[PDB]
């Protein structure tokens, strides 16, 4: 998610 | 796809200062946690700074705390480092990065790069001097010294020799000032006929010099 | 700080063959870890992120292991295009920090090198200075030991080596050997001598010269  | 592009590096003399931009496109640039890298030449990266999406947490390595300051104007969807005080060990390649929304750990997107030397050597063309050829097979080339900084190009009879020409790495001498040579092997049958000149041109100086190389005696 | 130690420095395989490298952590760094390869001119390409997890795109010959200390990148087999330097990079306490990479090149047949001498040019010697080039031309391995010798003296601290890039066609690699002097240091002496040795000679070879001659 933080890391697409 | 996510762009970057790193803008601003040169040649600064030690205790000077440089500004370096990352423009970065097609991706929301305020939402992401922006980074610094640098590579010296020959060594692995090293991480320099980071700078959160809002731009309120910012964190430095101790080599470059207090000379270099990360920012970035969200608006304009660019980053930048302002590096004051320069060292000859800051001479590397300068990427920047995106991190991730709340963390910069590793780094999938990098922009290019931008070259950074920080030298007290000054600018300078190169001398050229030829290396004159002594069974089937002669080698020959030209010594293209003392220039600074890089790089030199340097081509066979305006680029109709490529065949068998190795030119060699520049390599920083002693006094600051890098040299090299370029060499060229050709059939020893046409050490007579056929005519070999070097051409060497040093862009950041604007300077061009031809050297025909033959035998001697 | 913590240090990355990758192992081995330098990897020499053929195309096809498997290769593994290998990253040791100064202390424990879990599984935050990631790989990347790097050609010339280009930044870093992420392979690995996680210590094992495979990052988008990249094939799946490129696998990693480890946790804690100990890690391993492997390409189960190697391909032309994964000739490059690679590097690790720990994310497990700040500040991160990269290993000092493995390159890994392409292995071929020995290759002895031609050596030719060059005495400095009437130009150079005009201005001051004398530069006595050694070239070894077209050789593999890399390794090759290169020594000048004035009048039977070795010397040492007056010269600098430059290695070309493995040569895209024939992966030979070629050396230049350059010893610098004062044109009054070039005048004491008569001979001048670069001796080679290589795995590829049956026996060192040695160019020389007398100055004047
Ligand atoms: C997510 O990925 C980015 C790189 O795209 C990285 O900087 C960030 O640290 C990652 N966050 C994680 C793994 O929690």
């Given at each position: 998610?933080?890391?697409? | 796809?996510?762009?970057?592009?790193?803008?601003?590096?040169?040649?600064?003399?030690?205790?000077?200062?440089?500004?370096?931009?990352?423009?970065?496109?097609?991706?929301?640039?305020?939402?992401?946690?922006?980074?610094?890298?640098?590579?010296?030449?020959?060594?692995?990266?090293?991480?320099?700074?980071?700078?959160?999406?809002?731009?309120?947490?910012?964190?430095?390595?101790?080599?470059?705390?207090?000379?270099?300051?990360?920012?970035?104007?969200?608006?304009?969807?660019?980053?930048?480092?302002?590096?004051?005080?320069?060292?000859?060990?800051?001479?590397?390649?300068?990427?920047?990065?995106?991190?991730?929304?709340?963390?910069?750990?590793?780094?999938?997107?990098?922009?290019?790069?931008?070259?950074?030397?920080?030298?007290?050597?000054?600018?300078?063309?190169?001398?050229?001097?030829?290396?004159?050829?002594?069974?089937?097979?002669?080698?020959?080339?030209?010594?293209?010294?003392?220039?600074?900084?890089?790089?030199?190009?340097?081509?066979?009879?305006?680029?109709?020799?490529?065949?068998?020409?190795?030119?060699?790495?520049?390599?920083?001498?002693?006094?600051?000032?890098?040299?090299?040579?370029?060499?060229?092997?050709?059939?020893?049958?046409?050490?007579?006929?056929?005519?070999?000149?070097?051409?060497?041109?040093?862009?950041?100086?604007?300077?061009?010099?031809?050297?025909?190389?033959?035998?001697?005696? | 700080?913590?240090?990355?130690?990758?192992?081995?420095?330098?990897?020499?395989?053929?195309?096809?063959?498997?290769?593994?490298?290998?990253?040791?952590?100064?202390?424990?760094?879990?599984?935050?870890?990631?790989?990347?390869?790097?050609?010339?001119?280009?930044?870093?390409?992420?392979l690995i992120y996680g210590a094992s997890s495979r990052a988008t795109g990249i094939?799946?010959?490129?696998?990693?292991?480890?946790?804690?200390?100990?890690?391993?990148?492997?390409?189960?087999?190697?391909?032309?295009?994964?000739?490059?330097?690679?590097?690790?990079?720990?994310?497990?306490?700040?500040?991160?920090?990269?290993?000092?990479?493995?390159?890994?090149?392409?292995?071929?047949?020995?290759?002895?090198?031609?050596?030719?001498?060059?005495?400095?040019?009437?130009?150079?010697?005009?201005?001051?200075?004398?530069?006595?080039?050694?070239?070894?031309?077209?050789?593999?391995?890399?390794?090759?030991?290169?020594?000048?010798?004035?009048?039977?003296?070795?010397?040492?601290?007056?010269?600098?080596?430059?290695?070309?890039?493995?040569?895209?066609?024939?992966?030979?690699?070629?050396?230049?050997?350059?010893?610098?002097?004062?044109?009054?240091?070039?005048?004491?002496?008569?001979?001048?001598?670069?001796?080679?040795?290589?795995?590829?000679?049956?026996?060192?070879?040695?160019?020389?010269?007398?100055?004047?001659?």
């Open positions: 998610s933080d890391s697409d | 796809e996510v762009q970057l592009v790193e803008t601003g590096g040169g040649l600064v003399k030690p205790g000077g200062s440089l500004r370096l931009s990352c423009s970065a496109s097609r991706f929301s640039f305020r939402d992401y946690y922006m980074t610094w890298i640098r590579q010296a030449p020959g060594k692995g990266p090293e991480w320099v700074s980071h700078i959160s999406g809002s731009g309120s947490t910012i964190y430095y390595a101790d080599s470059v705390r207090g000379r270099f300051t990360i920012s970035r104007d969200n608006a304009k969807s660019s980053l930048y480092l302002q590096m004051d005080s320069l060292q000859a060990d800051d001479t590397a390649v300068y990427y920047c990065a995106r991190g991730g929304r709340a963390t910069s750990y590793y780094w999938v997107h990098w922009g290019p790069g931008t070259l950074v030397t920080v030298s007290s050597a000054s600018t300078k063309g190169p001398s050229v001097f030829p290396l004159a050829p002594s069974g089937g097979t002669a080698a020959l080339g030209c010594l293209v010294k003392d220039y600074f900084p890089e790089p030199v190009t340097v081509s066979w009879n305006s680029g109709a020799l490529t065949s068998g020409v190795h030119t060699f790495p520049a390599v920083l001498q002693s006094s600051g000032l890098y040299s090299l040579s370029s060499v060229v092997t050709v059939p020893s049958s046409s050490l007579g006929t056929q005519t070999y000149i070097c051409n060497v041109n040093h862009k950041p100086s604007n300077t061009k010099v031809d050297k025909k190389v033959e035998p001697k005696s | 700080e913590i240090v990355l130690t990758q192992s081995p420095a330098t990897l020499s395989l053929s195309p096809g063959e498997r290769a593994t490298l290998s990253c040791r952590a100064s202390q424990s760094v879990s599984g935050y870890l990631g790989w990347y390869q790097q050609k010339p001119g280009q930044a870093p390409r992420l094939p799946d010959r490129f696998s990693g292991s480890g946790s804690g200390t100990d890690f391993t990148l492997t390409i189960s087999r190697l391909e032309p295009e994964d000739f490059a330097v690679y590097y690790c990079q720990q994310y497990g306490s700040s500040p991160l920090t990269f290993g000092g990479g493995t390159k890994l090149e392409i292995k071929r047949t020995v290759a002895a090198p031609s050596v030719f001498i060059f005495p400095p040019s009437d130009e150079q010697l005009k201005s001051g200075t004398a530069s006595v080039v050694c070239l070894l031309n077209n050789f593999y391995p890399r390794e090759a030991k290169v020594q000048w010798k004035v009048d039977n003296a070795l010397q040492s601290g007056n010269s600098q080596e430059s290695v070309t890039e493995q040569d895209s066609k024939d992966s030979t690699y070629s050396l230049s050997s350059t010893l610098t002097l004062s044109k009054a240091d070039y005048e004491k002496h008569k001979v001048y001598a670069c001796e080679v040795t290589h795995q590829g000679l049956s026996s060192p070879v040695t160019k020389s010269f007398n100055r004047g001659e």
